[PDB]
Amino acid sequence: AMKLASKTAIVTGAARGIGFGIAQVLAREGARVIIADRDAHGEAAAASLRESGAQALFISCNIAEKTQVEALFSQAEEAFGPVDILVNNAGINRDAMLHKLTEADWDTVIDVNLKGTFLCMQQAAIRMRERGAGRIINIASASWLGNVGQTNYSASKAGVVGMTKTACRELAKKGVTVNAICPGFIDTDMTRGVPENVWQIMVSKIPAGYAGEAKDVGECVAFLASDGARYINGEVINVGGGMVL
Amino acid sequence: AMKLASKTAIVTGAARGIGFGIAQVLAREGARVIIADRDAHGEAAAASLRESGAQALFISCNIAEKTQVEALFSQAEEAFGPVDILVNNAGINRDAMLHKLTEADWDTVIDVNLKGTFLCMQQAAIRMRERGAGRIINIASASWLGNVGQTNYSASKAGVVGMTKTACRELAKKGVTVNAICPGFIDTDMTRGVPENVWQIMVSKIPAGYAGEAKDVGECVAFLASDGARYINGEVINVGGGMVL
Amino acid sequence: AMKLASKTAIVTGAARGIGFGIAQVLAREGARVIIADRDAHGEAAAASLRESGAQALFISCNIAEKTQVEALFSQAEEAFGPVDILVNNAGINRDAMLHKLTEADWDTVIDVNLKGTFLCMQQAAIRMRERGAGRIINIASASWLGNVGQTNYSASKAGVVGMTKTACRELAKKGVTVNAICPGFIDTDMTRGVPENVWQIMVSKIPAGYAGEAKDVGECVAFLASDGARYINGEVINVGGGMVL
Amino acid sequence: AMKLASKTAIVTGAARGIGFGIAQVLAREGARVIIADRDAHGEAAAASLRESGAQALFISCNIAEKTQVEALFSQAEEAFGPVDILVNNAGINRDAMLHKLTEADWDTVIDVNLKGTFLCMQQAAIRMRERGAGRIINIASASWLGNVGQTNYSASKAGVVGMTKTACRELAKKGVTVNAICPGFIDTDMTRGVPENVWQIMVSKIPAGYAGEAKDVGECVAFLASDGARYINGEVINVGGGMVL
Numbered sequence: 001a002m003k004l005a006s007k008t009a010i011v012t013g014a015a016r017g018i019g020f021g022i023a024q025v026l027a028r029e030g031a032r033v034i035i036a037d038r039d040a041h042g043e044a045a046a047a048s049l050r051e052s053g054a055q056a057l058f059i060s061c062n063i064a065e066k067t068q069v070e071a072l073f074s075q076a077e078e079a080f081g082p083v084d085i086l087v088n089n090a091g092i093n094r095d096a097m098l099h100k101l102t103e104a105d106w107d108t109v110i111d112v113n114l115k116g117t118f119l120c121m122q123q124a125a126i127r128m129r130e131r132g133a134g135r136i137i138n139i140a141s142a143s144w145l146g147n148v149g150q151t152n153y154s155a156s157k158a159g160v161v162g163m164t165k166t167a168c169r170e171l172a173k174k175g176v177t178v179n180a181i182c183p184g185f186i187d188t189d190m191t192r193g194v195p196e197n198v199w200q201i202m203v204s205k206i207p208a209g210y211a212g213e214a215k216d217v218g219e220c221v222a223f224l225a226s227d228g229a230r231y232i233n234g235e236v237i238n239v240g241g242g243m244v245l
Numbered sequence: 246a247m248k249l250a251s252k253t254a255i256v257t258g259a260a261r262g263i264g265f266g267i268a269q270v271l272a273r274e275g276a277r278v279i280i281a282d283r284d285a286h287g288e289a290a291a292a293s294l295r296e297s298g299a300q301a302l303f304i305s306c307n308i309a310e311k312t313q314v315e316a317l318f319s320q321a322e323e324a325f326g327p328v329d330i331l332v333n334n335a336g337i338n339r340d341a342m343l344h345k346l347t348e349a350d351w352d353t354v355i356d357v358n359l360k361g362t363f364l365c366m367q368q369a370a371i372r373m374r375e376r377g378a379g380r381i382i383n384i385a386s387a388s389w390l391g392n393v394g395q396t397n398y399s400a401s402k403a404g405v406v407g408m409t410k411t412a413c414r415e416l417a418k419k420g421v422t423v424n425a426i427c428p429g430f431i432d433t434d435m436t437r438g439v440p441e442n443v444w445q446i447m448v449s450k451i452p453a454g455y456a457g458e459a460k461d462v463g464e465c466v467a468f469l470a471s472d473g474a475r476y477i478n479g480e481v482i483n484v485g486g487g488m489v490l
Numbered sequence: 491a492m493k494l495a496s497k498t499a500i501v502t503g504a505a506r507g508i509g510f511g512i513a514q515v516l517a518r519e520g521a522r523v524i525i526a527d528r529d530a531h532g533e534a535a536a537a538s539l540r541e542s543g544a545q546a547l548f549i550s551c552n553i554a555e556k557t558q559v560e561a562l563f564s565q566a567e568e569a570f571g572p573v574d575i576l577v578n579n580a581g582i583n584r585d586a587m588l589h590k591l592t593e594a595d596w597d598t599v600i601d602v603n604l605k606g607t608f609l610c611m612q613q614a615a616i617r618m619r620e621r622g623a624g625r626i627i628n629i630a631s632a633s634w635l636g637n638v639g640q641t642n643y644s645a646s647k648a649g650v651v652g653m654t655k656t657a658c659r660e661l662a663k664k665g666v667t668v669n670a671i672c673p674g675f676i677d678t679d680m681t682r683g684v685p686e687n688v689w690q691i692m693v694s695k696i697p698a699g700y701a702g703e704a705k706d707v708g709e710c711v712a713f714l715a716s717d718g719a720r721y722i723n724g725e726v727i728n729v730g731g732g733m734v735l
Numbered sequence: 736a737m738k739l740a741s742k743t744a745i746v747t748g749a750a751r752g753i754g755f756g757i758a759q760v761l762a763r764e765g766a767r768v769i770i771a772d773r774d775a776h777g778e779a780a781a782a783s784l785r786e787s788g789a790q791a792l793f794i795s796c797n798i799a800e801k802t803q804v805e806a807l808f809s810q811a812e813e814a815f816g817p818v819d820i821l822v823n824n825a826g827i828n829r830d831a832m833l834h835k836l837t838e839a840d841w842d843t844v845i846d847v848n849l850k851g852t853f854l855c856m857q858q859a860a861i862r863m864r865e866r867g868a869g870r871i872i873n874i875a876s877a878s879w880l881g882n883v884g885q886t887n888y889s890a891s892k893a894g895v896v897g898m899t900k901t902a903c904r905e906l907a908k909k910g911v912t913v914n915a916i917c918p919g920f921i922d923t924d925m926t927r928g929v930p931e932n933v934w935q936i937m938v939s940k941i942p943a944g945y946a947g948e949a950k951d952v953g954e955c956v957a958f959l960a961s962d963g964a965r966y967i968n969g970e971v972i973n974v975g976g977g978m979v980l
């Protein structure tokens with residue numbers, strides 16, 4: 001009934017969008033969910049999961065700062081014990097054409113999407129490699145293989161895939177799986193913030209014929225986090241309705 | 246609790262090995278399973294499933310002949326109703342170096358592994374595209390990106406991945422998902438034939454440090470067959486403990 | 491002065507389109523070219539190369555038939571000596587939706603594009619693995635990763651990529667390189683035969699903004715065939731102006 | 736004749752190893768070469784290219800500082816005219832296991848390998864988009880798809896590949912090609928430091944049976960930088976004797 005019962009999970013950027021969708025599917029499978037986010041709306045997201053009957057806790061955290069990541073994993077374990085699942089979802093966009101991208105927009109996107117994902121992966125690796133069990137699921141983007149106006153975003157997401165495949169080689173023998181999910185075009189506050197015509201152009205590229213939901217990504221994460229996906233490691237699973245960006 | 250309940254699934258080459266493991270997982274999820282295979286032992290395989298408390302039926306069929314594939318879907322529907330899931334696993338080996346592969350061994354591997362997967366996929370498409378729903382899951386091989394002494398096998402499995410991505414672009418808008426699985430080194434009777442010393446050397450190369458089971462491939466098939474994996478389409482998922490052949 | 495000077499090369503389907511473009515560039519680099527094709531127009535193509543000051547010979551041949559492929563290499567070696575370069579370009583199209591592709595259109599495309607490419611590669615392997623030197627360049631398609639209405643073509647081209655990687659692993663230690671080229675959309679008689687709206691839709695996908703020329707593919711073949719590309723093996727190079735089909 | 740005559744090329748980190756090998760091949764093809772590196776030995780490198788009868792110049796430059804990258808392109812064009820070719824070879828290693836990598840070793844590798852490549856790519860894009868012609872060749876690593884003890888290096892090289900494909904989509908219409916090269920195990924003065932028993936293990940992973948040379952990478956750069964490779968764009972070409980890291 002609940003393939004993730006008795007498992008603690010940390011989901012970064014789970015205050016809204018895809019992150020909250022993953023927290024909802026993990027919580028539904030009986031997992032204790034730690035909502036890690038820099039926005040105080042994460043408390044409304046945790047209170048929403050507890051009201052549905054699940055066990056959830058919000059922990060304010062800027063994954064770009066190592067001291068806050070160390071504090072995140074410390075409080076999470078003092079709250080729901082050992083962390084068995086890590087979902088690196090936290091991400092941001094500062095789009096610009098290569099010839100216009102500012103050094104500031106470059107630094108912020110790489111510091112959060114790439115270094116941020118590194119600092120979290122590291123705290124999970126230090127623990128999971130000793131316990132001989134663990135699940136690391138990184139959210140990348142279909143943009144990891146190129147996308148106009150996303151020099152900094154494609155670089156960070158492509159970097160997340162490289163790390164995912166490196167972590168697989170170092171933690172696989174420790175009974176840990178590290179996999180990446182590349183969501184195509186999902187319906188969230190970020191995608192609803194783009195202009196009308198931009199929405200239709202993207203949906204016209206989706207063979208399924210519609211923008212995915214945050215739970216579509218959550219269903220794939222819940223599977224990789226289960227014991228049934230123990231032989232899937234270092235993979236990149238596209239959840240974009242067959243879209244080829 | 247029974248995600249595949251009320252769904253009929255056809256699994257080719259499921260008399261023994263990986264195909265039977267996939268049949269056991271689909272059955273465990275309360276799915277009516279059809280075991281299609283030339284091997285007569287398939288009758289004892291379907292019986293083993295009816296003994297576990299599931300509904301199963303063996304159909305002696307040669308997927309290389311279109312007239313027998315047309316009979317497979319006809320006989321499968323009048324029994325358990327509309328076919329919602331198709332698992333193309335049937336795949337034989339006739340290994341030989343490129344400079345010595347006989348024209349006969351080539352034709353046998355291609356006619357069964359590639360043309361066979363096409364004939365089954367075609368019959369599933371004619372039906373699923375009208376019912377506006379369906380699941381096609383092709384079992385290909387880590388050998389699709391090359392492997393010594395497998396020119397005919399690498400060609401066939403690489404071809405299966407090519408059709409998989411093509412079917413995705415033609416059946417996605419009809420609500421049908423077409424995905425492929427590439428198993429690594431799976432511990433089965435057929436594989437427990439090579440020298441034990443070569444087998445231990447092969448396992449030392451798997452990052453996970455152990456050979457997978459037929460159910461490992463099944464757990465992934467059961468997920469792609471669920472409604473929760475409706476947005477995963479045209480994907481190649483490796484089930485080899487993070488191994489790169 | 492000329493990189494491929496003193497080298498004999500066989501180019502299948504070099505009577506027109508990409509094949510003749512490849513033959514023109516190889517000849518420009520001082521390579522003795524063997525125009526292998528099933529159309530008698532290859533005799534005009536070979537004469538056009540001899541009139542340009544290069545050495546060329548046409549040999550009628552259906553790569554689908556092994557006895558005719560064996561006769562091709564025999565006549566090619568007694569004519570210009572040992573074959574140092576093999577370019578598998580010969581290919582056909584019998585496009586149709588998965589639910590309508592006839593068994594005849596399936597057999598013909600797989601027998602030419604896949605089995606035909608194999609029979610040629612096999613004759614090159616038998617000779618090159620003994621001479622300790624060689625070059626095998628297979629023309630695949632950007633459709634190897636899927637394309638609407640090309641279930642048989644994608645399967646055949648994907649199969650060639652799989653074989654390209656298998657051959658690499660078996661002949662790399664012999665000093666032979668096996669590489670594949672995936673042309674995007676090249677301006678030829680076949681491509682100029684499709685409707686005008688299809689031409690604009692295909693060209694609108696090319697970031698470069700135009701359909702490539704036959705010599706663009708030939709320039710890449712001339713490089714892989716040189717000694718400078720002795721450390722490139724088992725690669726899939728796209729020559730489609732950055733098109734992502 | 737020489738395919739790169741009258742062309743100005745910038746090769747970062749070309750004072751030694753692969754970088755200097757790339758400069759030698761570009762010089763041999765008649766291209767003016769700007770050696771950009773923090774290593775003062777870059778003067779002896781440029782002088783060695785002038786002794787061979789080519790036009791070479793050394794410009795001390797820290798690619799992590801945008802003001803020095805802006806001065807590099809300014810001083811480079813004032814001396815040898817418009818920059819037609821940009822080779823991003825600059826790279827460093829600060830290897831460590833995921834659970835040990837210091838924040839400092841992470842920052843220096845990302846600041847030089849990823850941000851450094853970005854700053855140079857940006858100065859090239861700003862100039863090449865107005866001229867309507869140009870070549871950007873990024874040297875990534877076989878480590879972009881993962882490698883033990885290289886979380887930071889695999890992240891920076893995978894990121895370079897991500898940028899490569901993004902720049903392709905934004906500069907293809909402007910007549911500019913952006914490609915990446917992934918060298919496998921290359922023999923350089925920066926690799927003959929490990930014991931031979933370590934060298935043998937790495938070589939047994941190379942199907943070619945031997946480690947490559949700096950010029951094997953240079954030959955591929957000279958081709959992509961030629962007018963004949965104008966239709967190759969957004970590609971990742973492996974130069975590792977068919978080795979799969």
Ligand SMILES: NC(=O)C1=CN([C@@H]2O[C@H](COP(=O)(O)OP(=O)(O)OC[C@H]3O[C@@H](n4cnc5c(N)ncnc54)[C@H](O)[C@@H]3O)[C@@H](O)[C@H]2O)C=CC1
Pocket residue numbers: 012013014015016017018019036037038039061062063064089090091092112116139140141142182183184185186187188189190191
């Ligand atoms: N939505 C889409 O269509 C696609 C998005 N993605 C990725 O999916 C992830 C989530 O996407 P959305 O839900 O649309 O994003 P969103 O912007 O709607 O929500 C992201 C959440 O991450 C949090 N966050 C951002 N930076 C953070 C940091 N440094 N530390 C902690 N929390 C931080 C924000 O507070 C926010 O709650 C991102 O990594 C995004 O790049 C991937 C491809 C497609």
Ligand SMILES: NC(=O)C1=CN([C@@H]2O[C@H](COP(=O)(O)OP(=O)(O)OC[C@H]3O[C@@H](n4cnc5c(N)ncnc54)[C@H](O)[C@@H]3O)[C@@H](O)[C@H]2O)C=CC1
Pocket residue numbers: 502503504505506507508509526527528529551552553554579580581582602606629630631632672673674675676677678679680681
């Ligand atoms: N033209 C394009 O845009 C693209 C073409 N390709 C591939 O490039 C190759 C050449 O394409 P095009 O020049 O446009 O085609 P084409 O039809 O103009 O020329 C192909 C040549 O192959 C020969 N041929 C066909 N079957 C043969 C057989 N069984 N034995 C011997 N010769 C045979 C034909 O006589 C013809 O001369 C084909 O393999 C094609 O699939 C792939 C990507 C795109």
Ligand SMILES: [Cl-]
Pocket residue numbers: 101102103104
């Ligand atoms: Cl700036």
Ligand SMILES: [Cl-]
Pocket residue numbers: 062064108111112
């Ligand atoms: Cl920040």
Ligand SMILES: [Cl-]
Pocket residue numbers: 021213214215216
């Ligand atoms: Cl949702």
Ligand SMILES: [Cl-]
Pocket residue numbers: 003226227228229464
């Ligand atoms: Cl499970």
Ligand SMILES: [Cl-]
Pocket residue numbers: 344345346347
């Ligand atoms: Cl033979």
Ligand SMILES: [Cl-]
Pocket residue numbers: 346347348349
């Ligand atoms: Cl034979």
Ligand SMILES: [Cl-]
Pocket residue numbers: 589590591592
């Ligand atoms: Cl039919």
Ligand SMILES: [Cl-]
Pocket residue numbers: 836837838839
């Ligand atoms: Cl530190």
Ligand SMILES: [K+]
Pocket residue numbers: 235236237238480481482
């Ligand atoms: K994949």
Ligand SMILES: [K+]
Pocket residue numbers: 725726727970971972
């Ligand atoms: K490639």
